[PDB]
A and B are shown apart, each in its own frame.
Chain A
């Protein structure tokens, strides 16, 4: 049942990869297309810092008591799009593309 969602996420149009993290930093499950364990350890260190930093800053440096971050959407050059959410203790980092890059990826596959 808990594997079918990983299959459901690649099925969504644009989706290259996903990586889930514990409260710790270990990656729980990643895609086969994005590198396994090597990048998953690397991509955890950045987002866990980026999250805990931003989580902290919004509660203190913005002087807004009780306002926790829900999503983070890093849009980039090419068509990459790094979406960071948090359900309970665990977090994750999906990577989607756009029509131009999806079309490029389909042409590369062809």
Chain B
């Protein structure tokens, strides 16, 4: 009757449950970027060359 009392209390709510435990953001908005790595170019040419 003393243990039955303690079983009852712990059976009310899990109390250790973590809401959305483990599972990550999943779908996340990713903006489309374009990183310019390196420019090439001619040096001291007569006019510009396309």
Question: Which residues of A pack against B, CB within 8 Å?
Answer: 8-9, 12-15, 18, 71, 73, 75, 81, 83, 85, 87, 92, 94, 96, 98-100
Pairwise interchain contact A75-B16, C-beta atoms closer than 8 A: yes
Nearest B residue to A84 via CB reads B3
The answer on a CB contact under 8 Å between B7 and A96 is yes
- Work out how many contacts link A and B, with CB atoms closer than 8 A: 39
What is the CA–CA distance of A55 and B37 in the complex, to the nearest angstrom? 70
Which of B3, B4, B14 is packed against the most chain A CB atoms within 10 Å? Answer: B3
Nearest-neighbour CB distance to chain B for A15, whole angstroms, equals: 6
| Whole-angstrom CA separation of A15 from B4 in the bound complex | 10
Bound together, the chains give a CA A99 to CA B16 distance in angstroms of: 12
Contact count band on B? 10 to 19
Contact A85 B3 (CB under 8 A): yes
Q: Please give, as numbers and ranges, the residues of chain B lying within 8 Å of A14 by CB-CB distance.
A: 7, 10-11
Complex Cα distance, B2 from A71, in Å, reads 9
A73 touches B16 (CB 8 A): no
* Cross-interface CB contact of A87 among B2, B4, B8, cutoff 8 Å: B2
Also in contact, A100 and B10, with CB within 8 A (given A9-B4, A87-B2, A92-B3): no
